[PDB]
Amino acid sequence: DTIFGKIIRKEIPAKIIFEDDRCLAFHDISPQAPTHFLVIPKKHISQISVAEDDDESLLGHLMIVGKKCAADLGLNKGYRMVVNEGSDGGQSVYHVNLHVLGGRQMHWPPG
Amino acid sequence: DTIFGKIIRKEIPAKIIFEDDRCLAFHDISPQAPTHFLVIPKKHISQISVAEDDDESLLGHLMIVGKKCAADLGLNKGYRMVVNEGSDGGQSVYHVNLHVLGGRQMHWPPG
Ligand SMILES: Nc1ncnc2c1ncn2[C@@H]1O[C@H](COP(=O)(O)NCCc2c[nH]c3ccccc23)[C@@H](O)[C@@H]1O
Ligand SMILES: Nc1ncnc2c1ncn2[C@@H]1O[C@H](COP(=O)(O)NCCc2c[nH]c3ccccc23)[C@@H](O)[C@@H]1O
């Protein structure tokens, strides 16, 4: 399975900042901002392009959890949420993952 | 209200590529990729940091609609989804909006 599959199954260790029945959040190993963490579903969805209609609430939950974690981490000046799909998106771990980045001005274009 | 509020109320014209009872999608006026469109809720939420828990399904719907529009627009090599919060996120229109960008390699960091 993927790296994130291994984190979910508790095969690879990770320092978590949030967990519930539906998702996990943890800091990125290669941070691109002073604050950079990930929110991932526990359900295996390899990429957002294959998410099903009934995954709507789960995907929204990732963003609500991202919002809450951002607040807890003191990102009061703002942040950026990112989901990458496939090669052009730069996906590297093929498990749906929401990036939340902040603590610096985020620029444009977003990559 | 905001620019997007005006688009929703059909005060400002916009060429739409998707509409339902909950959201609208349309191409960005200042595209940053060969394909760059936006998905916005019809409900007024000024920024993701003030989204409520019960907005989970709506937020997920934006991503599912983004996914579907991306497929329709032929983004088979991938894409990137982005939501900006506040000043550090680069928010400029204070109405929740999901960017979908593709048709080129998206780079890292994402801004
Ligand atoms: N054990 C662990 N704990 C915590 N974080 C972990 C981790 N193992 C891995 N990560 C992280 O997962 C993230 C996977 O995100 P992604 O959206 O699949 N690819 C985005 C990065 C990227 C790569 N190549 C690109 C090319 C062009 C654009 C972008 C890129 C990475 O930020 C980082 O590797
Ligand atoms: N009528 C119309 N039809 C179609 N698209 C329209 C439009 N009117 C406006 N837009 C678009 O809304 C988007 C608003 O996105 P945002 O996430 O609020 N800001 C991101 C851009 C940005 C700005 N400054 C920054 C600084 C640092 C990082 C980023 C930035 C813009 O891409 C573009 O202006």
Number of strands of chain A: 5
Task: Determine the CATH topology of chain A.
Answer: HIT family, subunit A
Q: Indicate the CATH class of chain A.
A: Alpha Beta
Please summarize the sheet with the most strands of chain A: 5 strands, antiparallel
Cofactors, ions, other ligands: the ligand Nc1ncnc2c1ncn2[C@@H]1O[C@H](COP(=O)(O)NCCc2c[nH]c3ccccc23)[C@@H](O)[C@@H]1O
* Percent range for β-strand residues of chain A: 25-35%
Structural class of chain A: alpha+beta
Largest interface, with counts of residues having CB < 8 Å to the other chain, equals:
A-B, 46 and 46 residues
Strand order of the largest sheet of chain A: 1-2-3-5-4
Do you know the CATH architecture of chain A? 2-Layer Sandwich
Distance between the termini of chain A: 28 Å
- The CATH superfamily label of chain A reads HIT-like
Radius of gyration of CA atoms of chain A, rounded to a whole number: 13 Å
The oligomeric state of the chains shown is homodimer
Order of helices and strands of chain A: HEEEHEHE
Helix coverage percent of residues of chain A?
10-25%
Count of all domains of chain A: 1
Task: Report the total helices of chain A.
Answer: 3
- Describe the global form of chain A: globular
PDB class: hydrolase
Keywords: hint, HIT
Assembly: dimeric
Entry title: Human Histidine Triad Nucleotide Binding Protein 1 (hHint1) H112N mutant Ara-A nucleoside phosphoramidate substrate complex
